[PDB]
């Protein structure tokens, strides 16, 4: 349902193959798991154990995602 | 009949995604910031995917259109073509 | 020997490789040894993965290779990981890894 | 509609290496995308090499140097060895 | 003889800033930029033809390719300037 | 000349030539070279505009690679377009973090 | 001399165009400037002011 | 050879990047990163010269190696 909302803002009256949604979910979760790996490394580097929004922002800054 | 629902939940899911990533302690503001990153990521991928459907003259976004859109986004994915 | 695959001792179809290489708009003309040599590289890389995938299948005590086995096989190899570094395998998961500081006392 | 794939040949290589093992449908399509990816990477690099050297044909030299670029050291060494063997075996017969 | 888009970069420069110049290094940088954008669009359009089982690169391949490579506003203005120029060419 | 027929400055003929002599497709459309050249001419006008402004700010007439670097990096979209591109003799933007500033 | 030294380990009796060396120097310094930018951001994230090798190692690990 | 980039050169590169205080081990760590970076780029550059049958690496080979290494560079060719 979330992806349907995002697509409605791009083009109206769209249908999705069930395999298209599953592929979107696969790449999304893999991106988020990998991001939390980099996020956890940043938090440990700051002599901390708890992840914080500054850790994710630092990770995406190093990746070049602005 | 009361209804009143919303979308973009993923409240415990951000906890499960953290465990598979190896995170031990999660602050409260991580979830809201995590949702924002997922929005931008989906916006980029779906944009390139919708563009192929526009070029292909179709009203249905196929799994392939997602694949090359992920390919264009440097997020190559095996399994769906 | 009628099929060019038999003439090269390879399993992958040299004819289909020659067809797809011509039907893909990479150059005007196409060499004769390129389809044989491209198929050999493809067959070697698939054999390498299936070898490590079959080993991971033996470790997981399963007869059929599942995407988990491919994920474990590719990422445990130092060179296959660099080749497929920008690639996510469906239903693959991640390697079990917990940082040292995160371990209990 | 006929759907082409490298499926039956992945089975042969699998049985040639591990005769008592199988593969799932999802993992099978994953191997298919792997073959197509490596296909496009080498053919794309060889296509660039042809344009870069003012040539109109992609020969064995373009494929060999393309694999030198894409594979890291050991995979490149073994790929060149297996390929040059097959090309010499093909040229013989 | 080595070809380049140099003389046309001068023309566009004078149309926008008539009292400005360019150096040889900056000109070669502009040359590589034009060729880079050239290869990206033509490469993406080539993929679009292969993906849709087509053998020709028409206006639609270029238009959707510019939709993919440029971020929003530059893509919006590029499609507008191009479709304007193609319509003016189609007239005469 | 087809470039004059479209009101464009970039050579539509040279674009059509390079599209055929590059092995991208069996055929090349007639409107594609005009439309590819228009995008290129627009993007060059975008850079040259911001480069000339940076030249005015530095009180210099001729545009040097410093001007191109400043022009591309000050634009949010030109930076995203050329994100994987390094310009020779371009340098970097003046940026000092807040914590590093003297207090 | 450094680039000739590194290339000597790949193939003997090689000549370099002067423009090829300048291009290597341009890309090398740009890579190093960009790396120290990411390095300084990492050091500031650790409530520090001085950059340290652990900052570069973390930055290049996240960069891949 | 590798020690030809030391003391102020590693300091000047830090100033353009915005670094204020530099630890002592940065200099050795910087050389190692630059070594690996040059090894990768020159390797792909030499590979093109091997295919082109030449004993001279041209400016293009450096540019094309950087393009394959995701380090696109403008200024030294088309």
Swiss-Prot record, chain B:
The modification Phosphoserine is found at residue 27. One of its GO terms (molecular function) is DNA binding. GO terms for biological process: nucleosome assembly. There is a cross-link at residue 11 (Glycyl lysine isopeptide (Lys-Gly) (interchain with G-Cter in UFM1)). The modification Phosphotyrosine is found at residues 31, 68. GO terms for cellular component: nucleosome; nucleus. It comes from the Eukaryota. The modification N6-(2-hydroxyisobutyryl)lysine is found at residues 11, 24, 39, 57, 59, 71. The modification N6-acetyllysine is found at residues 11, 39, 59, 71. This is Histone H4. It comes from Xenopus laevis (African clawed frog). The lineage of its organism: Eukaryota, Metazoa, Chordata, Craniata, Vertebrata.
UniProtKB/Swiss-Prot annotation, chain C:
Belongs to the histone H2A family. Core component of nucleosome. Nucleosomes wrap and compact DNA into chromatin, limiting DNA accessibility to the cellular machineries which require DNA as a template. Histones thereby play a central role in transcription regulation, DNA repair, DNA replication and chromosomal stability. DNA accessibility is regulated via a complex set of post-translational modifications of histones, also called histone code, and nucleosome remodeling. The chain holds residues 15 to 119 of 130 of the full protein. One of its GO terms (molecular function) is protein heterodimerization activity. Following DNA double-strand breaks (DSBs), it is ubiquitinated through 'Lys-63' linkage of ubiquitin moieties, leading to the recruitment of repair proteins to sites of DNA damage. H2AK119Ub and ionizing radiation-induced 'Lys-63'-linked ubiquitination are distinct events. This is Histone H2A type 1. Keywords: Acetylation, Chromosome, DNA-binding, Hydroxylation, Isopeptide bond, Methylation, Nucleosome core, Nucleus, Phosphoprotein, Ubl conjugation. The modification N6-(2-hydroxyisobutyryl)lysine is found at residues 23, 61-62, 82, 105. The nucleosome is a histone octamer containing two molecules each of H2A, H2B, H3 and H4 assembled in one H3-H4 heterotetramer and two H2A-H2B heterodimers. The octamer wraps approximately 147 bp of DNA. GO terms for cellular component: nucleosome; nucleus. There is a cross-link at residue 2 (Glycyl lysine isopeptide (Lys-Gly) (interchain with G-Cter in ubiquitin)). It is found in: Nucleus; Chromosome. The modification N5-methylglutamine is found at residue 91. The modification N6-succinyllysine is found at residue 82. The modification N6-glutaryllysine is found at residues 82, 105. GO terms for biological process: heterochromatin formation.
Swiss-Prot record, chain E:
One of its GO terms (cellular component) is nucleus. Keywords: Acetylation, Chromosome, DNA-binding, Glycoprotein, Isopeptide bond, Nucleosome core, Nucleus, Phosphoprotein, Ubl conjugation. It is found in: Nucleus; Chromosome. There is a cross-link at residue 88 (Glycyl lysine isopeptide (Lys-Gly) (interchain with G-Cter in ubiquitin)). Glycans are attached at residue 80. It comes from the Eukaryota. Monoubiquitination of Lys-88 by BRE1 gives a specific tag for epigenetic transcriptional activation and is also prerequisite for histone H3 'Lys-4' and 'Lys-79' methylation. Its main location: nucleus. One of its GO terms (molecular function) is structural constituent of chromatin. The keyword Iron does not apply. Belongs to the histone H2B family. The nucleosome is a histone octamer containing two molecules each of H2A, H2B, H3 and H4 assembled in one H3-H4 heterotetramer and two H2A-H2B heterodimers. The octamer wraps approximately 147 bp of DNA. Core component of nucleosome. Nucleosomes wrap and compact DNA into chromatin, limiting DNA accessibility to the cellular machineries which require DNA as a template. Histones thereby play a central role in transcription regulation, DNA repair, DNA replication and chromosomal stability. DNA accessibility is regulated via a complex set of post-translational modifications of histones, also called histone code, and nucleosome remodeling. This is Histone H2B 1.1. The lineage of its organism: Eukaryota, Metazoa, Chordata, Craniata, Vertebrata. The chain holds residues 34 to 125 of 126 of the full protein.
Curated annotation (Swiss-Prot), chain H:
One of its GO terms (biological process) is nucleosome assembly. The modification Phosphoserine is found at residue 23. Demethylation is performed by JMJD6. Monomethylation is performed by KMT5A/SET8. Trimethylation is performed by KMT5B and KMT5C and induces gene silencing. The modification N6-propionyllysine is found at residues 7, 20, 53, 55, 67. The modification Phosphotyrosine is found at residues 27, 64. The modification N6-succinyllysine is found at residues 7, 53, 67. There is a cross-link at residue 7 (Glycyl lysine isopeptide (Lys-Gly) (interchain with G-Cter in UFM1)). It is found in: Nucleus; Chromosome. Core component of nucleosome. Nucleosomes wrap and compact DNA into chromatin, limiting DNA accessibility to the cellular machineries which require DNA as a template. Histones thereby play a central role in transcription regulation, DNA repair, DNA replication and chromosomal stability. DNA accessibility is regulated via a complex set of post-translational modifications of histones, also called histone code, and nucleosome remodeling. Belongs to the histone H4 family. This is Histone H4. It comes from Xenopus laevis (African clawed frog). The lineage of its organism: Eukaryota, Metazoa, Chordata, Craniata, Vertebrata.
């Amino acid at each position: 349902r979330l992806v349907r909302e995002i697509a409605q803002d791009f083009k109206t009256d769209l249908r999705f193959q069930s395999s298209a949604v599953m592929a979107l979910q696969e790449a999304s979760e893999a991106y988020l798991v990998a991001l939390f790996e980099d996020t956890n490394l940043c938090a440990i580097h700051a002599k901390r154990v708890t992840i914080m929004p500054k850790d994710i922002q630092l990770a995406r800054r190093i990746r070049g995602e602005r | 009949v009361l209804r009143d629902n919303i979308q973009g939940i993923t409240k415990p899911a951000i906890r499960r995604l953290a465990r598979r990533g190896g995170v031990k302690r999660i602050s409260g503001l991580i979830y809201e910031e995590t949702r924002g990153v997922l929005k931008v990521f989906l916006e980029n991928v779906i944009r390139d995917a919708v563009t192929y459907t526009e070029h292909a003259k179709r009203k249905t976004v196929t799994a392939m259109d997602v694949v090359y859109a992920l390919k264009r986004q440097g997020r190559t994915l095996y399994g769906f073509g | 020997a009628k099929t060019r695959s038999s003439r090269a001792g390879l399993q992958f179809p040299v004819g289909r490789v020659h067809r797809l290489l011509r039907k893909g708009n990479y150059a005007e003309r196409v060499g004769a040894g390129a389809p044989v040599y491209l198929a050999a590289v493809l067959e070697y890389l698939t054999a390498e993965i299936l070898e490590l995938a079959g080993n991971a299948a033996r470790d997981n005590k399963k007869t059929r290779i599942i995407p988990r086995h491919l994920q474990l096989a590719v990422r445990n190899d130092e060179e296959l990981n660099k080749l497929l570094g920008r690639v996510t395998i469906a239903q693959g998961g991640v390697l079990p890894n917990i940082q040292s500081v995160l371990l209990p006392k | 509609t006929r759907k082409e794939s490298y499926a039956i040949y992945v089975y042969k290589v699998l049985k040639q290496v591990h005769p008592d093992t199988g593969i799932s449908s999802k993992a099978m399509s994953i191997m298919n995308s792997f073959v197509n990816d490596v296909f496009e990477r080498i053919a794309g690099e060889a296509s660039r090499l042809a344009h870069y050297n003012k040539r109109s044909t992609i020969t064995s030299r373009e494929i060999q140097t393309a694999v030198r670029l894409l594979l890291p050291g050991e995979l490149a060494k073994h790929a060149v060895s297996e390929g040059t063997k097959a090309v010499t075996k093909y040229t013989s017969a």
